[PDB]
Every structure is written in C-alpha cells, then in structure tokens.
Amino acid sequence: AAKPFWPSDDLEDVVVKPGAPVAGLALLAPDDTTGCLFTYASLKEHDEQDEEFAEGSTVEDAWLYGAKLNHNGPFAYATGNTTDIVKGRVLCWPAETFEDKLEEVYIFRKFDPDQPQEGSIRCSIAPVVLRDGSSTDAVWFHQTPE
C-alpha cells in the first residue's frame, strides 16, 4: 500500500458501491411490452426445441422476406431481394423476460463461431410476416458474407 495507489481524489469518489448500472444489449424501447426472436433452419434446434430456453414463449410460424442462407455456416443474411424468403418461427416473451432471453442466445451464438470466415455474427430487428399477412418486429441473427 503506502503512497502508491493511494487515491488523490476524494475516497468517496473512488470506492465502488453496490447497484451501479450494468451493461446490456437493451434492444427494446421503454415503450415495448413484448419482444420477439425469429429463428430458422438449424438455429431452431436451440431457439425452439431447447425446453429451458424456449420456455414461457408464445410461438408461431413466420416468414422473413429479403434474406437468404450462407452456403456454409447456419446463418442467413439480408439481400433485400423480394423473393428471397427464410421461413421460420417467431418466439415472443414479455419485454423484461425477452431482454434476458436475447442476451442468453446472443452469448450462445457468438461464443464459438463455426464459420468465422463468412463474417461476424450480429443480430438486428426486422419485420417478419405472420400467416394472416400481418407483420411483427423480431430480432434475428445473421452472418453477412462480409
């Protein structure tokens, strides 16, 4: 100890206290009451079929227009082509629960990328189209060939 590492600032300004604001993704607005995840192809194995992850959701079919698969790796990416369609499932949770689910799957997908060559794995919000033709905003994961 001694003189080294003794703070020249006020001790009160330097001692860390419980309850600081923690980092997070926080993808929802303060308005949003629901959050949804769009899953597809082999990603459904975890997102839909893992009982402890998918628990508490509502789930229905949905289509993502303008996206297509990478040739390797499990992810799609956005092309903007009207007839490129990724069919999948949208899982929805109350907003507070969704924030935890989204972080959990974000960590799960990005811990050990199978094909780091096909780009970086990210997620964003896109409208997905439900059976009745209505749309709902959902988070989806993608790996853009760049």
Of 107, 123, 93, which is closest to residue 27 (Cα–Cα)?
123
What is 35-143's CATH topology? Hypothetical upf0131 protein ytfp (3.10.490)
State both tokens at 4: 């080294």
Query: How far out from the chain centre does Cα 30 lie?
Result: 17
> Which value in Å is the resolution of this experimental model?
2.0
Distance, CA of 58 to CA of 12 (rounded, Å): 48
Distance, CA of 121 to CA of 76 (rounded, Å): 10
Distance, CA of 85 to CA of 112 (rounded, Å): 27
Distance, CA of 108 to CA of 103 (rounded, Å): 8
Method underlying the structure: X-ray
> CA-based angle 85:86:92, to the nearest 5?
130
Q: What per-residue string of b and e applies to 12-22 under the rule 16 or more CB within 10 Å gives b?
A: eeeeeeeeeee
Of 129, 32, 35, 44, which is closest to residue 85 (Cα–Cα)?
129
Task: Tell me the backbone φ, ψ of residue 123, rounded to 5 degrees.
Answer: -140, 155
Q: Which amino acid is at 128?
A: V
Distance, CA of 102 to CA of 34 (rounded, Å): 12
> CA-based angle 26:72:36, to the nearest 5?
25
State both tokens at 49: 């079929």
C-alpha distances out from residue 59 to 2, 37, 71, 92, Å:
61, 10, 27, 6
